[PDB]
Each structure stands twice: as structure tokens, then as C-alpha cells.
Write a protein that binds this ligand. Structure first.
Ligand SMILES: CC(C)C[C@H](CS(C)(=N)=N)C(=O)N[C@H]1Cc2cn(c3ccccc23)CCCCCCNC1=O
Ligand SMILES: [Ca+2]
Ligand SMILES: [Ca+2]
Ligand SMILES: [Zn+2]
Ligand SMILES: [Zn+2]
Length: 167
């Protein structure tokens, strides 16, 4: 595993998040469930707790967008970059954006598995960098293992716990 330079991390006991926009590919209820699932995958290993808010600012702002969307990291259409997240910090820090030009799926269809993509992106939102281990969720490319049957690897757990300590 690798953390970000200067290992930024959330210092609060609870970190909020808010889904600002949704994808046309899934029901809104599924995205909400999958984001909670993804945050819990990491939360289970550490002292943090998460709370969803539906208005204003949240530490982790989540949204779907196609093309240019304000932050100077335009999406590129179907394929290639699927999504991108930023290291913990104020403003854009900690946010996670998903390329709406992708065909998002809960796993029952062809497309990009949103639970897997959200686990990777929220890993970045928490301060995780990329792993060299092809089996890790934090590996840079999609598809090595099985998007429909996966869990954090020992490498991902070692990294998140180094950053925030064990629960
Ligand atoms: C790990 C994921 C959940 C999310 C990451 C998000 S990121 C930014 N936060 N590390 C991602 O988008 N990875 C790209 C990386 C990537 C793979 N290729 C690319 C060709 C061009 C540009 C990027 C890529 C070659 C094949 C392209 C096919 C599309 C699959 N794309 C990827 O796997
Ligand atoms: Ca933020
Ligand atoms: Ca894309
Ligand atoms: Zn963005
Ligand atoms: Zn990544």
C-alpha cells in the first residue's frame, strides 16, 4: 500500500458525506446503499464513523458528472478514467466523482460495478494511495479479480489501519 504525501487523513471522529448527484443507470436507493456499503468496508477496520447529510457541505461530497465539471479534471467519455477522488482536506479534498459516461451497474449487468469503484474511490477519500498488489482494491486498474465477489485485501487493511489505527 502507499498513503498520500504528508499522509493527510480525517482527524474528526465522524466524517460526513453527501451524495450531490445521481447516475441515470441505477436507482437512487441503490447508489445510497452501495456508498454506505463501500464506506463500511473501510470503517469496519478503523475508528472513524460516517454520517450522510442531504444538504450543505459534507466532508465527502459524492457526485456523477460527464466531461468538464468545475474541478479542472474533466472526465473523458466512456472508458479510460472511470472516476477520481481527492485526498482528505477542506473543499474538494476528500470528494469523489464518478464518470457518468460510464455504464454503472450493481453487478447484475454488463458495465462498471459501482460498489467496487466506490470502495476504491472512497479509499482515496480516506487517504489511501495506489497499491502495487494486483489483488488489492487500491490497485490502479479495474478488472483483475472479480468485481462481484471481493473484499479488502490484507494490503488495503494494513494501509487504512496504519493511517487511522485499528478498531
Ligand atoms: C480502479 C478503478 C475503480 C478506478 C480508477 C479511478 S482512479 C483515477 N481514482 N485511480 C480508474 O479509472 N482506473 C482506470 C485506469 C485506466 C486503465 N486503462 C486506461 C487507459 C487510459 C486511461 C486510464 C486507464 C486501460 C483500460 C481502460 C479501460 C477502463 C478501465 N479504467 C481503469 O481501470
Ligand atoms: Ca470535501
Ligand atoms: Ca471515462
Ligand atoms: Zn472531478
Ligand atoms: Zn485510484
Amino acid at each position: 500500500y502507499s498513503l498520500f504525501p504528508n499522509s493527510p487523513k480525517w482527524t474528526s471522529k465522524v466524517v460526513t458525506y453527501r451524495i450531490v448527484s445521481y447516475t441515470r443507470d441505477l436507482p437512487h436507493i441503490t447508489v445510497d446503499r452501495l456508498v454506505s456499503k463501500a464506506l463500511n468496508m473501510w470503517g469496519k477496520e478503523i475508528p472513524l464513523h460516517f454520517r450522510k447529510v442531504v444538504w450543505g457541505t459534507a466532508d465527502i461530497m459524492i457526485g456523477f458528472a460527464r466531461g468538464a465539471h468545475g474541478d479542472s479534471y474533466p472526465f473523458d467519455g466512456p472508458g479510460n478514467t472511470l472516476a477520481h477522488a481527492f485526498a482528505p482536506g477542506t473543499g474538494l479534498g476528500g470528494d469523489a466523482h464518478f464518470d457518468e459516461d460510464e455504464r454503472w451497474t450493481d453487478g447484475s449487468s454488463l458495465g462498471i460495478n459501482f460498489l467496487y469503484a466506490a470502495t476504491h474511490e472512497l479509499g482515496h477519500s480516506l487517504g489511501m494511495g495506489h497499491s502495487s498488489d494486483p489483488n488489492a482494491v487500491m490497485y490502479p486498474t479495474y478488472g483483475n479479480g472479480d468485481p462481484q465477489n471481493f473484499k479488502l485485501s490484507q494490503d488495503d487493511i494494513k494501509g487504512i489501519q496504519k493511517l487511522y489505527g485499528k478498531r
